[PDB]
Amino acid sequence: ASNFTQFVLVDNGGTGDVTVAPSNFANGVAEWISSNSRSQAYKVTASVRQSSAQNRKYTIKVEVPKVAVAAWRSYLNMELTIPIFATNSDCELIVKAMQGLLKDGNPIPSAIAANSGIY
Amino acid sequence: ASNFTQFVLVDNGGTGDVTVAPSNFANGVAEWISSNSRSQAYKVTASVRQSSAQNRKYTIKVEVPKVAVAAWRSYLNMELTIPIFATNSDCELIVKAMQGLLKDGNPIPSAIAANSGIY
């Protein structure tokens, strides 16, 4: 009865998609890994805290390797800070803002996916 | 001929969606803001550097306010580190991983949108 479930990290629209499965939950940090080896696996990592009096802070980390062993890993680090005063609709709005930030034709994902810069 | 264009940050599927427009580009930091007032506007902020010898590092910041003036702002901070060795297909894969991380039914956006925690 928890969110700690496997999900499709990279959706390739078929059999080639990447699925990360729950691996570990220690120190409030949930970790998903792919079925690949330790050096070949995608790694998602999420945690949340209310250490501050005003905010929930989600810490999300994604490790994207490139096939080779991994020749390299790309690291994504998200820090989402949500005031505790925020309702469910507000948090849905925040999730929509994050989703539309990386919408496929948008500036920032276009700069990232085309290796170029912003502006 | 640049990515520094307006885009729909929050896609509400109609007239209620949030659109951020290019505002400023100084110190390599592009800034989008909404048509709302300074205290009411969504604020996207993106930058990229190659200070390290191995990585491009994208820094993305989103400020989501709640209507009220803003009673509060939610802050998202993304740091995407991409090796310079990465091709266009690799960066597309990285963008897909970020997009599927926040896919609507997935663990992490479900925890965020339902105010709950991970696991």
From TrEMBL, chains A, B:
<comment type="similarity">
    <text>Belongs to the Leviviricetes capsid protein family.</text>
</comment>
<comment type="function">
    <text>Capsid protein self-assembles to form an icosahedral capsid with a T=3 symmetry, about 26 nm in diameter, and consisting of 89 capsid proteins dimers (178 capsid proteins). Involved in viral genome encapsidation through the interaction between a capsid protein dimer and the multiple packaging signals present in the RNA genome. The capsid also contains 1 copy of the A2 maturation protein.</text>
</comment>
<comment type="subunit">
    <text>Homodimer. The capsid proteins form dimers that assemble by group of 5. Twelve such pentamers are linked together with free dimers. The homodimers binds to the viral RNA via an operator hairpin, but also to many other RNA sequences in the viral genome; this interaction probably shifts the virus from the replicative to the assembly phase and ensures specific encapsidation of the viral genome.</text>
</comment>
<dbReference type="GO" id="GO:0003723">
    <property type="term" value="F:RNA binding"/>
</dbReference>
<keyword id="KW-0694">RNA-binding</keyword>
<dbReference type="InterPro" id="IPR015954">
    <property type="entry name" value="Phage_RNA-type_capsid"/>
</dbReference>
<keyword id="KW-0810">Translation regulation</keyword>
<dbReference type="GO" id="GO:0005198">
    <property type="term" value="F:structural molecule activity"/>
</dbReference>
<dbReference type="InterPro" id="IPR002703">
    <property type="entry name" value="Levivir_coat"/>
</dbReference>
<dbReference type="Pfam" id="PF01819">
    <property type="entry name" value="Levi_coat"/>
</dbReference>
<keyword id="KW-0946">Virion</keyword>
<comment type="function">
    <text>Acts as a translational repressor of viral replicase synthesis late in infection. This latter function is the result of capsid protein interaction with an RNA hairpin which contains the replicase ribosome-binding site.</text>
</comment>
<keyword id="KW-0167">Capsid protein</keyword>
<dbReference type="GO" id="GO:0039617">
    <property type="term" value="C:T=3 icosahedral viral capsid"/>
</dbReference>
<keyword id="KW-1142">T=3 icosahedral capsid protein</keyword>
<protein>
    <recommendedName>
        <fullName>Capsid protein</fullName>
    </recommendedName>
</protein>
